[PDB]
Design an enzyme around this catalytic site. Structure first.
Site, short mmCIF file in Angstrom:
data_model
loop_
_atom_site.label_atom_id
_atom_site.label_comp_id
_atom_site.label_asym_id
_atom_site.label_seq_id
_atom_site.Cartn_x
_atom_site.Cartn_y
_atom_site.Cartn_z
CD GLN A 96 7.92 -5.89 6.07
OE1 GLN A 96 9.03 -6.30 5.72
NE2 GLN A 96 6.79 -6.48 5.68
CB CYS A 132 -8.91 -2.80 12.22
SG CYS A 132 -8.01 -3.61 10.86
CG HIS A 176 -4.61 -8.84 1.53
ND1 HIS A 176 -3.76 -7.81 1.87
CD2 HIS A 176 -4.29 -9.19 0.26
CE1 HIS A 176 -2.94 -7.56 0.86
NE2 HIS A 176 -3.25 -8.38 -0.13
CB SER A 182 -4.30 0.73 -0.51
OG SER A 182 -3.30 0.18 -1.36
CG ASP A 238 0.53 -5.89 2.92
OD1 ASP A 238 -0.34 -6.77 3.06
OD2 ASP A 238 0.49 -4.81 3.55
CG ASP A 277 -0.79 -3.55 10.94
OD1 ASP A 277 -1.92 -3.92 10.55
OD2 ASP A 277 0.12 -3.21 10.13
CG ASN A 278 -2.76 -7.87 11.94
OD1 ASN A 278 -1.82 -7.13 11.70
ND2 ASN A 278 -2.91 -9.05 11.38
CB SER A 285 3.70 -2.82 10.76
OG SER A 285 2.52 -2.97 11.53
CB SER A 326 -0.14 0.08 -4.31
OG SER A 326 -0.96 -0.02 -3.14
CD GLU A 331 3.30 -5.08 7.05
OE1 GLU A 331 4.51 -5.36 7.10
OE2 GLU A 331 2.80 -4.15 7.74
CG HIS A 368 -1.64 -1.26 1.45
ND1 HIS A 368 -2.60 -1.68 0.55
CD2 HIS A 368 -1.59 -2.20 2.43
CE1 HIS A 368 -3.13 -2.81 0.98
NE2 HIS A 368 -2.54 -3.15 2.12
CG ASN A 381 0.34 -10.94 10.42
OD1 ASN A 381 -0.23 -9.88 10.20
ND2 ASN A 381 -0.23 -11.93 11.10
CG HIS A 385 -3.53 0.25 10.27
ND1 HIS A 385 -4.88 0.11 10.03
CD2 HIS A 385 -3.05 -1.01 10.45
CE1 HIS A 385 -5.20 -1.17 10.06
NE2 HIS A 385 -4.11 -1.87 10.31
CE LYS A 417 1.27 -6.45 10.07
NZ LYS A 417 0.04 -7.14 9.60
#
Ligand SMILES: NC(=O)c1ccc[n+]([C@@H]2O[C@H](COP(=O)([O-])OP(=O)(O)OC[C@H]3O[C@@H](n4cnc5c(N)ncnc54)[C@H](O)[C@@H]3O)[C@@H](O)[C@H]2O)c1
Ligand SMILES: NC(=O)c1ccc[n+]([C@@H]2O[C@H](COP(=O)([O-])OP(=O)(O)OC[C@H]3O[C@@H](n4cnc5c(N)ncnc54)[C@H](O)[C@@H]3O)[C@@H](O)[C@H]2O)c1
Ligand SMILES: NC(=O)c1ccc[n+]([C@@H]2O[C@H](COP(=O)([O-])OP(=O)(O)OC[C@H]3O[C@@H](n4cnc5c(N)ncnc54)[C@H](O)[C@@H]3O)[C@@H](O)[C@H]2O)c1
Ligand SMILES: NC(=O)c1ccc[n+]([C@@H]2O[C@H](COP(=O)([O-])OP(=O)(O)OC[C@H]3O[C@@H](n4cnc5c(N)ncnc54)[C@H](O)[C@@H]3O)[C@@H](O)[C@H]2O)c1
Ligand SMILES: Nc1ncnc2[nH]cnc12
Ligand SMILES: Nc1ncnc2[nH]cnc12
Ligand SMILES: [K+]
Ligand SMILES: [K+]
Ligand SMILES: [K+]
Ligand SMILES: [K+]
Lengths: 462, 462, 462, 462
Positions: free
Chosen positions: B387, B196, B316, B82, B132, B191-192, B383, B77, B157, B54, B182, B375, B187
């Site tokens: 990486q 959200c 996803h 995105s 990702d 992130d997840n 995250s 991307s 990711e 993204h 992930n 995010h 992460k």
């Protein structure tokens, strides 16, 4: 009717305890589903279980499930303040040996465990152990090692007790295999987190009747118990600050909307009064320890706390708070059982109108069980269904009957498999009236699972 | 400077993008700390990274961190909606090859990935992959195997991409080792989930400007994304119901205060209209899919939804919702980019005043990124620090240069060690002004950890 | 088709605006119920309404409801940043005179109001006024007093505008009767509180994309707007502190779980830098003014704020923040429209990488409308149904046509009766699918109300 | 000291009660501030107060404040289950006549009020009344009119009692003036709302120990008590539905994030079983009545409730629930005091293992006070500071000594002035450590208030 093999506070509380057990059964579908499923099979016939866990109504349902599956038991509580006397009475009145009352002394606590271990002055022919915190396990290893030659396994309930089991395994001193019940998801999440969310604010209200909304709390620790404890207070409107040594847990606290602070300047606990953040501690109305560690609310912190702050501990052992310092230096005024004003004016009597005191709950022992009734039945259902499955597994494995070669390959600390963890959870969801969706074959293939589960790899953290 | 090796919507957005990158750097202390720590060492000197993720402002800070550590990159991307065009413009204006714009067609999406893989019509000298969702990884394995010979690793990711990597590993078709980024706690459980929580309601508001308080939502799934999504909606005052196939996740939903329901009677998804709980779906104002699975908001569910319900997906890939059924049968009225009214009257044009429509966001693609900005920087910091650490590790391992027998020992999908996860978390906590406490030597001994960590066993779930 | 009596940013945005109006109609059941109820009666036939209120999609639905009931209108926005250009375009394209665009200068703002007042260079034959904040009302009284001889009433939307009306009434300078629309419960609660809960965090996310969870906020004021604003931030996980001058409002903040603080030591604002609580302000990441008062985020506060803090105002007028001080002393770097970095290094240019800046949203003007889209349609339904009822009442009263003796007994500022407030609320509840219970005759007698209401005395506070 | 003019459960509980009074004094800064401010002046010297209000620890601090200001009192509880026996004991041991215990019969309840009215078998020389719910007020008017001749006023605590006073005033039967203490903001929007938020879930936990998270609740009513009650349950994780007859209150419920439902199809309560929404009531685990109305949880609703649902009332009087129907038709199994299983199998004994029962708390009487301790001290501080101010005002007015023509001008039900409401609130805010900001002279002029307040017009709703 001549049953005398018990010691409880008041046997006449039995009918009240039985009424509460019958209600609790209706709140414990996973545990009562195991009772119905296995009653005919009698998988615990011949089991003789020494049990040491908080003698609550919920533990009563656990006990009678083990008995219904064929076991004999001898029971004590694992904390001096956690027994519900009506539960202990109902169990004794059913002919089950139990030695437990609310408000034991330390000497009485040890005597109670000893009364499970001994029957008629001699070691009972025990062959299974169910423990919460490791005290019974430790006594058996240190004082009654010969009894461990006949025991097939230990099923340990709590985080602190598992730590003790793992130290013994690493040191080659564990003598029988064990199941870590704590680390099922239906235990660790349900009990350690959600149970404390329900029961921490409950205990503070019962002990003090204090308004919590608008007041300042400091929660020491942000593991499962600290997460649930912080939520218990935040949902009441407390302004909650969180302390942690684990930066991942501290990150979760920040993201959960808490300010992360340390009692010590720059987090450095060098033992001096100078290291205390006196401005922070001087604004705190409530401190709760949740760590399983030692001296996380220390003497200098207690000296710096705001006048009339409440101090309590929801970790397993009281040494999270330096209550020994308070016993040596400050006068204790009992308000009512498990509630003491600790007068910081000195130790030589107290002024009933002194404003410089702290309120200590449960003398620093587990506050949810000490000042209220611990976790609710519908939460304990998960933990105790796990205990029953684990007792069945270890008793059927028969470690004590194996040749020495088979024993070596089985001396371990294990967890329940994920499929069983899921089956417990399903019964819990149904108890809420929840409806779980069934994957289609195509969906199961798409994510790489069986329609029947397990649905996650063992690495999944939920 | 004569740079033309890029394709973006509008290069004149670069200065705006650069202003947002400079703000984002101040919101990303873990990532910028890595830039400062490693800039002199140049650990990625010689790395040539194909990146597919993204093309947001947050990804821009990731890209420039990799470049700052010595890498060259070619970027696209991983979703057609995105990209933030000002981010893509700022990266291209810095002389970095990027092929990305918001609103690509599927053909353009594939062309953009191909422009990273090829330079001047021939394979670029790539030696690392950052992905990702696994699309770039799949293209390389299927169409450019000779390029994988020289690639040292993949850093993946997201949950869906990891599943694809594990399928390849199990089938013996994965050609280079990978890091599952992930599954770091900083992460997955940042992130997840928390990402959200911030960005789902954000996207719904931008797309529709609907009041959410007091309305009915159904969240399909209760993994990390489903947990964060349900919270995103509950905190706005929605009445949220949760569907799940995993009873453990369903138990969490119940204990977190949500009603757990199935779109299908008794949870049985047998493909008939009769299996749909029409009464339930007829009351839902918003449905959000969070599963990573296929067809979890199916054609019969879409037929049964309340008029004017919003339909969106935050997993996803768009096949969580049967948008193909909607394209075949129903007329689409574009309200504005990434917002369509789907008229259930039929497909032969539409009535602008018809009351019987659904509002589909982002054509069923990741809604947080499609209708808002995904995010926030301070969450993506975690995250993306992971990486960078993963790129450094696999690049320094130099798998492509190893002999065959040594490649065999190293062909795996691994996670970052807990110590690094904790070090990322510590920088994030400091970014909030949080203060982590340091264990005393006695406390560290008491719980069995080093003062420096790691503080938890690898089995710990947080 | 030769309609030219308007000025908007871009008439080609009309079709998009019309699509959003059609969606908004479905979100505004009270307002669209008034349209259906009164369309045949044409109760506003002959009304010629000067309107000055934020030219949003929601105001578009209000405008077209007035027109549908028979009115002619001439419209402007009441803030330079609050117009949605697609709404203004859709209204202009329907043949309705509107002079409004996002990003007006102050001179353009006054010119727009003047274009409603004048038609073909001469005063329009206006006979009704709808105002939000009192600017149009003030211009008519000061600059066009002769026009007020023909106007039957003013219907004023907001708290600040009502204050101005009451000052005029007390001073004998109000020339026509007015209805205080703000103080209906279906306005003041719904709009002032709930609207800000939805739209404050929305605007901050759109302007900055900042993570809010875990960060420190200071909300100045805890009236209806401050209550809703504090909730908007707390539900995102901010640590919210609240300032107030009203101890009753401060008590509510404490009980709602907020820490109540003052920017000034001991609350004393003596004008010196020494009075600022620099430690408090140095930890604040976001300040939001909600008071309707002057200079509540003053120059010394702005100097003391944490680097990179966000500063915004959701009260009616920008003078809540001393932006004049910032214009005089500090360099402004525009990030994008309605987002400026204010560099505290000085006024002579800026360093794009300077870390010592504040982010000001909407140049200090109403941030929810400036950086997002203000309140959602389903909330504005309540406010605007009240406006329509109030316009009907005052237009039917015909104050301008009465003898001078009748005028004296009618020169007042009034509220809508509770029965109408309840009827609006009922339509709102039905829009959620809520079901209100009907009292039995015995129950109505028991509490002393009619089965049809009103259900509370006029003193009831809800 | 030879004092016998009292009747309590157990005088030996006095020392415990006194310890709790001393703690409560530290939680009640407004009330204790009044004690300090007025003790030297003795404004209640000569006052002889008949008091009828829940004999809790909080009421003890109220009583002793009145005595500290010069009053003598004779006291009873206004509910059969709300006394805290240690509070009653502490008051009696101080030489204060009190007739109150937890678990009175209805005959005992009436006898206790009569023992306050009569001293040594003859009317006491009362001259003031403090009442909660109007029972003592009604007895005086119906049975002791000669005593009212010498009484200066009534200070009435609660919504239900105020309604009764207003009915008397409208019928010309009220004989002495009254202060409506309920309608101070520091009473109504503190006690009625926030008090129930603290104490409802508290009482449910003490009575049943049920997990509330994940279960379904129905709250009947959404006034002040209904708002606080719904929050009490929602913050525990219940899925809360709200019923209302007032559409404004219903709108608030929707906007606050609750689903608004009726027990009756289309809200029509026509007395037939067919009108019951059996599907809705069959899913409810907990019903709470909050209305002050009659039969809002009726016989047909009770028949339709889910098995094992909890039924309780937090409004003033038990007739909100049709407990008479349950007494006539169903068998009551006492679990423990104030907790009964109501067996829907019939009335001819009960089966201890029957699954078809409801759990009724406090026999339908005020549940927060019956099953826990009512509101916490820091909340009751507001209500009771208002009570003291109201007693001082009416006692100093000396209505009983006025000539008939002057009595006529003063026979009213009045509220305390806003300035006093604000002064109470300020002391409460200081008790939390809150800091209220002082307006500058320019700011006070800008909003049209005095720097000292009042800060809002009398119409303001907060
Ligand atoms: N009272 C109850 O009902 C109950 C229920 C479950 C477990 N427990 C007990 O509670 C304790 C915690 O259990 P858990 O499952 O949450 O364990 P955990 O390992 O998940 O969490 C404990 C946390 O304390 C933190 N910590 C350690 N030392 C610290 C210090 N000096 N300052 C701040 N934080 C520190 C650790 O980093 C860790 O995150 C154990 O003793 C466990 O047996 C009690
Ligand atoms: N949009 C974003 O910013 C974002 C962020 C992270 C991950 N993702 C994506 O979101 C998806 C979910 O990721 P995750 O980390 O939450 O995975 P996860 O494995 O933690 O959770 C997915 C959940 O869906 C459930 N599920 C599967 N099929 C279901 C069905 N038919 N009905 C109901 N529940 C069902 C599973 O039981 C599981 O608990 C993946 O595609 C991932 O790549 C998106
Ligand atoms: N942006 C929007 O959508 C929107 C919506 C409604 C109203 N408004 C505007 O918002 C403002 C507030 O409206 P309201 O209805 O909440 O008014 P309100 O009277 O209910 O509340 C304003 C509060 O500010 C407090 N206050 C005043 N001076 C203060 C100071 N120096 N420090 C701290 N607190 C102080 C007052 O005590 C009061 O409680 C008005 O200008 C109104 O017109 C804006
Ligand atoms: N237990 C406590 O501590 C406590 C505290 C304060 C007041 N009270 C009592 O609680 C009751 C409520 O007080 P309040 O201040 O909230 O009054 P209120 O007038 O603010 O609210 C009562 C609500 O009930 C609603 N209602 C009436 N009949 C209804 C029906 N059939 N179905 C649904 N809703 C209906 C009304 O519309 C109203 O909004 C009174 O009896 C009061 O004396 C108890
Ligand atoms: N109620 C309970 N019973 C037994 N063990 C517990 N641990 C926590 N709560 C408990
Ligand atoms: N969307 C909106 N339209 C008009 N006036 C408003 N005031 C606040 N939000 C508004
Ligand atoms: K319990
Ligand atoms: K973003
Ligand atoms: K809007
Ligand atoms: K109390």
């Amino acid at each position: 009717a001549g049953f005398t093999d018990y010691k409880v506070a008041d046997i006449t509380l039995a009918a009240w305890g039985r009424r509460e057990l019958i209600i609790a059964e209706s709140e414990m579908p996973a545990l009562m589903g195991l009772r119905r499923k296995y009653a005919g099979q009698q998988p615990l016939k011949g089991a003789k279980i020494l049990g040491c866990i908080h003698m609550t109504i919920q533990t009563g349902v656990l006990i009678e499930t083990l008995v219904a599956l064929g076991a004999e038991v001898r029971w004590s509580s694992c904390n001096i303040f956690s027994t519900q006397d009506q539960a202990a009475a109902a169990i004794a009145a059913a002919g089950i040996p139990v030695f437990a009352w609310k408000g034991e002394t330390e000497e009485e606590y040890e005597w109670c465990i000893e009364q499970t271990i001994l029957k008629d002055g001699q070691p009972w022919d025990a062959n299974m152990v169910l423990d919460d915190g490791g005290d019974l396990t430790e006594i058996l290893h240190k004082k009654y090692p010969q009894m461990l030659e006949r025991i097939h396994g230990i099923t340990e309930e709590t985080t602190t007790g598992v730590h003790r089991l793992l130290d013994m395994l690493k040191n080659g001193t564990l003598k029988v295999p064990a199941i870590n019940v704590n680390d099922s998801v239906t235990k660790s999440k349900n009990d350690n987190k959600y149970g404390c969310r329900h029961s921490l604010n409950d205990a503070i209200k019962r002990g003090t009747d204090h308004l919590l909304s608008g007041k300042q709390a400091l929660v020491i620790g942000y593991g499962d118990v600290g997460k649930g404890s912080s939520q218990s207070l935040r949902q009441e409107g407390m302004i909650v600050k969180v302390a942690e040594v684990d930066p991942i847990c501290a990150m979760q606290a920040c993201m959960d909307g808490f300010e992360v602070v340390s009692p010590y300047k720059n987090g450095i606990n060098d033992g001096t009064e100078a290291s205390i953040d006196a401005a922070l501690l001087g604004k705190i109305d409530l401190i709760v320890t949740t760590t399983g560690n030692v001296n996380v609310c220390d003497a200098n912190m207690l000296k710096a706390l705001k006048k009339r702050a409440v101090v309590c501990n929801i970790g397993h052992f009281d040494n999270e708070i330096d209550t020994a310092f308070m016993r040596k230096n400050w006068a204790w005024e009992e308000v009512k059982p498990q509630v003491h004003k600790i007068h910081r004016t000195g130790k030589d009597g107290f002024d009933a109108h002194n404003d410089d005191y702290l309120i200590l709950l449960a003398e620093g022992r587990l506050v949810n069980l000490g000042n209220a009734t611990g976790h609710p039945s519908r939460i304990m259902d998960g933990s105790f269904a796990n205990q029953v499955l684990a007792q069945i597994h270890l008793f059927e494995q028969k470690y004590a009957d194996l040749p020495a070669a088979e024993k070596a390959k089985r001396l371990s600390v294990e967890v329940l498999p994920k499929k069983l963890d899921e089956e417990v959870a399903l019964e819990m969801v149904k108890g809420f009236g929840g409806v779980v969706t069934q994957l289609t074959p195509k969906q199961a293939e798409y994510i790489g699972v069986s329609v029947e589960g397990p649905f996650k790899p063992d690495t999944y953290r939920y």
